[PDB]
Design a protein around this ligand. Structure first.
Ligand SMILES: CCCCCCCCCO[C@@H]1O[C@H](CO)[C@@H](O)[C@H](O)[C@H]1O
Ligand SMILES: CCCCCCCCCO[C@@H]1O[C@H](CO)[C@@H](O)[C@H](O)[C@H]1O
Ligand SMILES: CCCCCCCCCO[C@@H]1O[C@H](CO)[C@@H](O)[C@H](O)[C@H]1O
Ligand SMILES: CCCCCCCCCO[C@@H]1O[C@H](CO)[C@@H](O)[C@H](O)[C@H]1O
Ligand SMILES: *N(C(=O)NC1CCCCC1)C1CCCCC1
Ligand SMILES: *N(C(=O)NC1CCCCC1)C1CCCCC1
Ligand SMILES: [Hg+2]
Ligand SMILES: [Hg+2]
Ligand SMILES: [Hg+2]
Ligand SMILES: [Hg+2]
Ligand SMILES: [Hg+2]
Ligand SMILES: [Hg+2]
Ligand SMILES: [Hg+2]
Lengths: 162, 174
């Protein structure tokens, strides 16, 4: 009778609902897009912009940053709760939104770890990942940033059922 | 003898398929669970194999490590992408695991599987770029020496191997 969809798959009703996940997803979309944009403007990664130590081993990074990365990662895989469902109401649905937000969470956490280890932001990371110069990569990232801002605000169609 | 006709109550079209679709296309929680088991096995084998041989799994499988991502074999990249999308349920998460009317439940197993998928993909990317397997990576990450990190990894290996075999309690429902 009880669904196993809470914290770490529990059935006790503890943990995030799909709505909470969606919200955190929106915040992640905005944060990630603003990280990319911000690096485009300032030429520095978001951690360096916030004046957090970079180009260092993970264990020397700020514990709050590390716990934020852990939180983001565990959130992306729904380990903090995935309660209830999104159903079609009898062009993006709220589930699509949820997955855009999960992609955002993944990419964000990734770029953060990368900036901790190497000292380079998501843009430079993309350049080294692909081997394509920055000037050719910025128009695509800008399109991505716009999409993230759009999705972050887009309500999405469908309702949430416990 | 003849059954009373039951009236069609509004149907529930759930958005839990491939990238959240409702058309019923994508993995079920059972599929995800299986792929998760495969990831547990692969990850534990990577950690153990490196622990014994001192070489990363990609080095063992005769793949170029210490290269940029784009120069890497496209099947490896595709496997990593597949694992990452699977971990977040992007490839489908159809259905539910429910309690049956004291070990791991099927859902717990699913999440151990997703953690395994995450860690595996990360370790593979890292080995591609740096040329160091998961164990060496852990050593650099934590700053804990190999000798002090090995027992904890072995524990994690045994944990993943047992979980991979364990079916978990509960049943699957659409
Ligand atoms: C550094 C990160 C620290 C925070 C860890 C978050 C753990 C998840 C708890 O979830 C909460 O549990 C309630 C129980 O029902 C829900 O009702 C509620 O929606 C949700 O907010
Ligand atoms: C560190 C930044 C990110 C952490 C935020 C996680 C909190 C989860 C709560 O859920 C959301 O909270 C809002 C207000 O409580 C509501 O507007 C929204 O409807 C609800 O779904
Ligand atoms: C608001 C979105 C996220 C919060 C941003 C706050 C991060 C600002 C951190 O400041 C930096 O903290 C360092 C400690 O690591 C100090 O060493 C350094 O001198 C200081 O500049
Ligand atoms: C990429 C590495 C992993 C390979 C499999 C990925 C596709 C999902 C297949 O589904 C699973 O296949 C098993 C085959 O026997 C079944 O037992 C099981 O019931 C079923 O859920
Ligand atoms: N690629 C990326 O981050 N690759 C590596 C870089 C070193 C750290 C590990 C990952 C992309 C760039 C940022 C956007 C998402 C990933
Ligand atoms: N990995 C890392 O920093 N720590 C762990 C992550 C789990 C698997 C073992 C390594 C990084 C990922 C890519 C950048 C290089 C290492
Ligand atoms: Hg240190
Ligand atoms: Hg490159
Ligand atoms: Hg429910
Ligand atoms: Hg009959
Ligand atoms: Hg190249
Ligand atoms: Hg270190
Ligand atoms: Hg269902």
């Amino acid at each position: 009778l009880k669904v196993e969809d809470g914290l770490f798959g529990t059935s006790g009703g503890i943990g995030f609902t799909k709505e909470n996940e969606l919200f955190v997803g929106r915040v992640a979309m905005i944060g990630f897009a603003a990280s990319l944009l911000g690096e485009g403007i300032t030429g520095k990664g978001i951690l360096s912009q916030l004046n957090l130590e970079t180009g260092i081993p993970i264990y020397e990074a700020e514990p709050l940053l590390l716990f934020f990365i852990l939180f983001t990662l565990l959130g992306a895989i729904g380990a903090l709760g995935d309660r209830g469902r999104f159903v079609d109401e009898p062009g993006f649905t709220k589930s699509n939104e949820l997955f855009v937000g999960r992609l955002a969470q993944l990419g964000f956490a990734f770029s953060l770890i990368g900036e901790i280890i190497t000292g380079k932001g998501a843009l430079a990371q993309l350049n080294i990942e692909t081997g394509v110069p920055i000037n050719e990569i910025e128009p695509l990232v800008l399109l991505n940033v716009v999409f993230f801002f759009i999705a972050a605000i887009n309500p999405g169609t469908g309702k949430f059922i416990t």
